[PDB]
């Protein structure tokens, strides 16, 4: 009878920024979509390896909400077989993603007038991330061949930045909500199920 | 609800010492910076240094480089400013910024517009 909690998600009073990307764990509970379904508002709302029209029919062994805030430009990145900034160095889908990626313009909450600068992305890492790897070190980046020991200068650069959020930024440097719901199926008992 | 509050300011004689405190109180600046500016009378506002908080690197305008020294205690919420070598000409009012954007490039907090400052302390130098 108990519903899992989308809207303590989706409805969160602060987003995490996309290095330090938030997952919460659903389970044990009914997974009632109709409150998506009857959403305009979204960017875009995407699912892969299932019809968005099947989700109030579909059990999952395991369900994971993935939440953060990015720029316009870089929505397309959370997306199966990407590459770019947030894809290699931030956030990254497997190739085979199953689940669904939901993002919506956030300017209302995320700008204000002199810019907001709360939310962080990596600019540098030695390797691409794995699927669903998170890193919020901020070991200075070593770009040369000598050591920075922890100490920025040439070739020695903090890994995040800011994003600048000004109300005047053109669309692709607005800021978006992203919510990823991943579905886990596995030989396991289902948790998560629809109404119907 | 953020406030700088700069202490330290004073009289000086070329060659001595003065050290400059800004407490903040309402926040951090966590992995952004904080800086000293200054302002002669009818002298436009000038870059004088630069700390990363978290990491504690420091960057510094070529006029003060190897006599002023910036630092910070997190525990105390307070960045510093250690002026030695004092020469006239460091004669300005000195006040304390914040920065709430990260910038991956420290050099950056020489040009960038800070969102924060303190209401200033009178720095005078005798010759």
């Known amino acids: 009878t108990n519903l899992c909690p989308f809207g303590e998600v989706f409805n969160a009073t602060r987003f995490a920024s996309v290095y330090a990307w938030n997952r919460k764990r659903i389970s044990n509970c009914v997974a009632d979509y109709s409150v998506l379904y009857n959403s305009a508002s979204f960017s875009t709302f995407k699912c892969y390896g299932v019809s968005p029209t099947k989700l109030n029919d579909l059990c999952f062994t395991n369900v994971y909400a993935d939440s953060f805030v990015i720029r316009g430009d870089e929505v397309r990145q959370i997306a199966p077989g990407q590459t770019g900034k947030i894809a290699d160095y931030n956030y990254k889908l497997p190739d085979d993603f199953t689940g669904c990626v939901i993002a919506w313009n956030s300017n209302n909450l995320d700008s204000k007038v002199g810019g907001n600068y709360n939310y962080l992305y990596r600019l540098f890492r030695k390797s691409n991330l794995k699927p669903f790897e998170r890193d919020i070190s901020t070991e200075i980046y070593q770009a040369g061949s000598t050591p920075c020991n922890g100490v920025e200068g040439f070739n020695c650069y903090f890994p995040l930045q800011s994003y600048g959020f000004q109300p005047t930024n053109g669309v692709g440097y607005q800021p978006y909500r992203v919510v990823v719901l991943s579905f886990e199926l596995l030989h396991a008992p289902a948790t998560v199920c629809g109404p119907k | 609800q953020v406030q700088l509050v700069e202490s330290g300011g004073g009289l000086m004689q070329a060659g001595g010492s003065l050290r400059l405190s800004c407490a903040v109180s309402?926040?951090?600046?966590?992995?952004?910076?904080m800086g000293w500016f200054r302002q002669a009378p009818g002298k436009e506002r000038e870059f004088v240094a630069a700390?990363?908080?978290?990491?504690?690197?420091?960057y510094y305008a070529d006029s003060v480089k190897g006599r002023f020294t910036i630092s910070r205690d997190k525990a105390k919420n307070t960045v510093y400013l250690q002026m030695n070598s004092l020469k006239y000409e460091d004669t300005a009012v000195y006040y304390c910024?914040?920065?709430?954007?990260?910038?991956?490039?420290?050099?950056?907090?020489?040009?960038?517009?800070?969102?924060?400052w303190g209401q200033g302390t009178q720095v005078t130098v005798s010759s």
């Open positions: 910024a914040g920065f709430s954007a990260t910038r991956s490039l420290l050099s950056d907090y020489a040009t960038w517009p800070y969102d924060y």
């Open positions: 309402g926040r951090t600046f966590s992995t952004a910076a």
């Open positions: 700390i990363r908080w978290s990491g504690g690197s420091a």
